[PDB]
């Protein structure tokens with residue numbers, strides 16, 4: 764079933780730098796890598812799909828002046844994507860989430876959000892959707908997330 768679309772929210776910024784790492788070795792926060800595939804119709808892993816991510820910092824704050832915690836990549840030849848970041852903090856009124864825009868070559872933009880398992884605000888945030896839940900395990904110093912996007916596209 765194709766990845767549901769959700770609100771952009773207040774804090775998107777166009778023209779994000781191309782980067783698969785949103786942090787450095789001095790960024791505050793609990794380490795988090797989100798990786799997975801983008802599939803199209805009929806389980807075809809999709810190549811060259813744009814993935815533009817953005818999230819709050821460890822304290823729950825979005826960077827409107829710069830491009831902190833903003834960065835986009837393109838899925839590899841085998842369909843995989845990889846995002847190195849830290850766990851975002853709770854912005855007031857929202858459950859923990861990371862935003863993403865996904866765009867297959869020449870198709871319209873999918874704007875959506877990824878959620879974390881076992882967040883208490885999942886009971887109360889109306890935007891929370893199980894289809895958008897990442898799988899998260901505790902690898903090493905920080906946490907590893909996985910999610911597959913499914914795009915209605917051949």
Ligand SMILES: [Cl-]
Pocket residue numbers: 879880881882885
């Ligand atoms: Cl949950």
Ligand SMILES: [Fe+3]
Pocket residue numbers: 772774818819854857860862
């Ligand atoms: Fe947000």
